[PDB]
A and B are shown apart, each in its own frame.
With several copies, the nearest count.
Chain A
């Protein structure tokens, strides 16, 4: 278990349209997986095969929840579109979202110049060496998370590559990312856009909502 921590910085703003008009203030682990998948497959790194299968977890790609001036990552509040920091009391909020109207199109985007958390918990050191290579490509050539990647949006660049061994710190959890616990309430929607079948599947799995322990969406925090 050798997890690669970091704080990514948005060099260019990102756009995550979710559902019913609402957007996503920070990018999620889904986007991280997908982008690392692309980087791996386009560089023919072997691990790419497993990344197709979503029901996996030898490398769990947790979300890109933002970090603050209080150091500690922002955390999802009880039924709120805001993420008050644990230490200190600053909110992330929908003040990062901006309605953009460009050449007829009308989408929304989160402003750039922010600092988010990189946390890829590697369960077995088997794939940690390939994890070094994917964070090498991110360290040099950036990683583009979100919509309009070919147009240039979502330019995240890592600023620290701290490869730290971590424990599953199970205890007793907090659901730091809305997860599909059987038939919970919040509707969660994903995608498996596979190249070499041209197959785009809008998969949906209803579950719980972040703001309320087999190892470490599906994240957990001490409470």
Chain B
């Protein structure tokens, strides 16, 4: 058969934030930070990728005119004939793409830096509330691996435009503040038998 092996390499252009999801690792950081960055137990920063790719292609392919399943609502069901539902899966059939977490190349204490964010009273022009949050520095390199099995020729082009959308829109959180502006690079390869 045929399987695609899109190796994605990200470089951060403006500070990155994806929230920490393990409750115990969160609470063991809520003494110091109030928004800890998602981190492995190997002290590496991992970002969810599949949702971002899917969302970008859903929004784009919908705006182009193609009937796609918007799964950003609380539908709790896609259909089985969507352009994305073939690629990033459906609720009865698995995904052709198996998008991996965008794990880092460097460890934390080399990419993640605590930070200060503010809320400023509009009249007093001074801080009302202050909070700490972690972030990933600019220039930090991340890697992933998309694994589209049964390629459908458009699949690579759809994945790379998705990447262009997540370069305009952003990956992670606080994306309306200026966070998570990234730059991907694609070096694809078609694995076969041995």
Contacts and interface: CB of A to CB of B under 8 A. Distances in A.
Given A112-B42, A151-B99, A100 B1 contact: no
Nearest to B194: A133
Given A12-B40, A43-B193, A150 B1 contact: no
A13 interface: yes
Contacts of A100: 21-23
A70 to B, nearest CB: 20
Nearest to A155: B100
Given A109-B22, A151-B50, A42 B100 contact: no
Contacts, number: 78
Interface residues of B: mostly helix, strand, loop or mixed? loop
A11 B46 CA distance: 11
Interface of B: 1, 3, 5, 21-25, 40-42, 46, 48-51, 88-89, 92-95, 97-101, 103, 144-145, 147, 149, 191-194
Contacts of A11: 42, 103
A198 B92 contact: yes
Contacts of A13: 40-41
A202 interface: no
Contacts of A195: 94
Contacts of B194: 133, 136
A20 interface: no
A142 B99 CA distance: 13
A152 B101 contact: yes
Nearest to A99: B23
B193 to A, nearest CB: 6
A144 B89 CA distance: 17
B98 A144 contact: yes
Contact of B1 (A44, A102, A109, A112): A44
Contacts of A44: 1, 193
A113 interface: yes
